[PDB]
Amino acid sequence: RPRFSFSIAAREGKARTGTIEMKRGVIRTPAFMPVGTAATVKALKPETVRATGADIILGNTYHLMLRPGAERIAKLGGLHSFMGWDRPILTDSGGFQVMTKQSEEGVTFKSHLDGSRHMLSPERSIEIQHLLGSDIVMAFDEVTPYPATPSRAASSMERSMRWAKRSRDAFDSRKEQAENAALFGIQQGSVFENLRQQSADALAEIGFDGYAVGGLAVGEGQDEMFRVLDFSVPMLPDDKPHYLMGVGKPDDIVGAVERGIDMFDCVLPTRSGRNGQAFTWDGPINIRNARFSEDLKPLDSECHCAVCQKWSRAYIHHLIRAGEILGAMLMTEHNIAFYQQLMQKIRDSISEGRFSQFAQDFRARYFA
Amino acid sequence: RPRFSFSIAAREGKARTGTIEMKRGVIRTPAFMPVGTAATVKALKPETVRATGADIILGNTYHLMLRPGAERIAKLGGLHSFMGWDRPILTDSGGFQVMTKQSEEGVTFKSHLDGSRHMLSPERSIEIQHLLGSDIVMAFDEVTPYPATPSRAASSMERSMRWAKRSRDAFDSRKEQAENAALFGIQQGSVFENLRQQSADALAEIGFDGYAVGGLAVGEGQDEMFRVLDFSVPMLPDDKPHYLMGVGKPDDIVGAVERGIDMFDCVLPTRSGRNGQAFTWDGPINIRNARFSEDLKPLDSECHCAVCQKWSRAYIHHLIRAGEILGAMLMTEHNIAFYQQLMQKIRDSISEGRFSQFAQDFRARYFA
Ligand SMILES: Nc1nc2[nH]cnc2c(=O)[nH]1
Ligand SMILES: Nc1nc2[nH]cnc2c(=O)[nH]1
Ligand SMILES: [Zn+2]
Ligand SMILES: [Zn+2]
Description:
Largest sheet of chain A: 9 strands, parallel
Strand content of chain A: 15-25%
Oligomer: homodimer
Largest interface: A-B, 33 and 33 residues
Strand order of the largest sheet of chain A: 4-15-14-13-12-11-7-6-5
Number of strands of chain A: 17
Bound molecules: guanine, zinc ion
C-alpha cells in the first residue's frame, strides 16, 4: 500500500465517497473515527472497535503526552503496539485540549493531573505524534474562541498559518515520519469568509495530504456551523480529504457530508454511552429513564450490532442505573456500531446516487 | 440431562474430581464459580466468562432482590435470560449479606441503597431464588459471627437447622422448582466439632442435593479454617458435592480441595482485578506498582488467556492507573481465567493421581 492515496469513487452534489489507502490499511470515506482518549477507546477492546466497522481511530496527543508519556510509549513500541490496534490512527495536535502562557513559539501549560509543567509548539507536537507512531498527523494550530472579533480571528488564523508551515517543515525533517505518515493542515478564520479563504490559500500553498476545517466545534449552533461549511469547504482542494474536527451528532454528520466533509471524530457515542444516551434511528434515548425498566426490545430494533442481538433495553437500564461496567461496555459498543452503520448508509447512498433522499428520510425519522 | 446427578470419577486421599450434571449443563468439579453481583460478572460479557472455562456462576440474592427486584426479573423471563448466561447459576440465600430485626420467623432489614424495608425468611428466600430461576438454590441460614461462644454457636446452628427444614419444605412445595433445580443445605457450628457433627446429622436427616460448609468465610485465618475442614468435611455425605462458601485465595482452594471440597466461589478475582491485583503462578502482583510501567511481559508468562496473548503489563498498568474501564475488563478476564486454569490443573492432577505433588509444587512456586 502507498503512504497515502485518496480516491473518490462517487459524488452527489458536494458529497463524495471513496477511500484513503495507507500502509496500515484502507479507510472508507465518509469515515467516523472513534476517539481513544489515553490509548483506549473507552470500555472496548480494539477487536470490538474493529468489529463495529471502524477503519481508523483517533488518539489524543495532549492526554498521551501527560500519561503515560510520549517517550515511554515510543520505548514500548509505539501506540499501535501498546494498545493493540494495528490499523491507522490519526492523532490530534494537542492544541485544543491545552486550551497557560502563549507566544509565537508555542504554549507552556500546567498538567491538569499533576501541576507538572509542559510545552507544546508546532515542532514538539509533530515530534510527539512521531513518537506515538501516528499515521495521520495534525498540524499544530492556535484555537480561536467563539465568538471572536474580526481582528482576533485574523491574528489567530495568521499565527496558525505560520505554525502550519512550521508543522510541515518539522514533519518533512523526519525521514521515517515523512515516508510513512500523512500530514493534515487545519483551516481557521472563525465565521469570516475572507479569513477562511486566506487560510485555505495559505494551506494549499504549503501543501498537505488532507485539510481539516477547524474552529467549528465550539458553541456556534448547527445553523451557523452549516453556514460556515457552505463557503469554507469549497475553498479546500477538492482532491484531498476534508476533515471536520470534533463533530458530532448524527444529524451534524449528515449535513456536513452534504457540504463536502469526508472525516469526523467525536466523543459523543463513547461519552454519551457511559452516561445513558443510546442512538437510535428514531433519535437518542436515555436508557436510564423508567419507561425502559421492563422493555424487552433491543436498544434499536434495526441495529445489527452484537448488543442488539443479545440484550434488552431493560437489562441495560438496570446495568447503567446500577453503575455496572458492563453497562458502559454495551452502550458504547452499540453507539459506536450505530455510528458505523450510519456512515455505511451514507457511503452506499452516495455511491448509488440517492444520498439526498437518504438525508431527507434520515431526518424525517430521527426527528419524529 | 437429569435435574441433578453428581458422579465422582477419581479420588486421591480426600480430594475428588467429577461432574455434576444438570438440565442447563455439566459442571466439572472441583469447580470455581465467578460471582455475578447484580446480574453481571463485573466487567465481563457472559461469553467471556464462558471462554475462561467457567461452567456455572453465582448470583447474589440480596442484591438482586433490591435491584432490579426478583418479581421484575421473573416478569422479564428469569435471570438467565435477563443477563444472557444460559448455563447453571447457583444463587446464595441472601442471609450473609443482610448480616436489622431478627427472629425465629426470619429477618427484616433496611435496604442499604434506599432505606426501603424488606423481609427475608427461609420461605421468602426460596421464593426469590425460584423467581430468579436459579438452578442451585441455597437453604436460608443464620450467620454465626466469629468468634462465637459455644452457647451462641449452638443456638444459631440449631436455628439454622430448623430453617434448613423450612427451606426444604418450601422448595419441595413448588413443583417447577422441585423438578428442575437442586437444593443445598449449609452446615454450621462455628469451630466446634460436636456442633458441626450435630449440624451434619440434621442436614443429612433432612436430605439435600449438596452440602455447604458455612461459617468459615469470616475472619478466622487459614490455619483455623483448615483445622475446621479437617473434621467437618468427613461428616457430610460422601456421595454429594461439598461447597465451601466465600473461599477464596488460590492457596485456600488447593488446601480445601485436599480436605474434600468440590465447589468454591469468591469475589477476589473480580474485585482484586478492578483494584490492580493480578494472580500469577509466582503469586499475586499489584499491576499499579511502578516496577511494571515498562514491563512488556504479559501478566503471567504461562497463562493461556486472551489478555496474556495480546497485552503487556505495561499497558494494563497504564489503564489501571488511569482509571480506564478497559483496565478492569482485562484484569478481570485474566484473573477469572487464571482461577479456571487452576481448577483445571487441580482436576487433571486428581484424575492422574498426582494431586499431592501438584499441591506441593504449586505452593513452592506461589510462595517463592
Ligand atoms: N486542533 C484542533 N482541534 C479541534 N477540535 C475541534 N476543533 C478544533 C480545532 O479547531 N483545532
Ligand atoms: N449463606 C451463607 N453464605 C456464606 N458465605 C460465606 N459464609 C457463608 C455462610 O455461612 N452462609
Ligand atoms: Zn445496537
Ligand atoms: Zn492471563
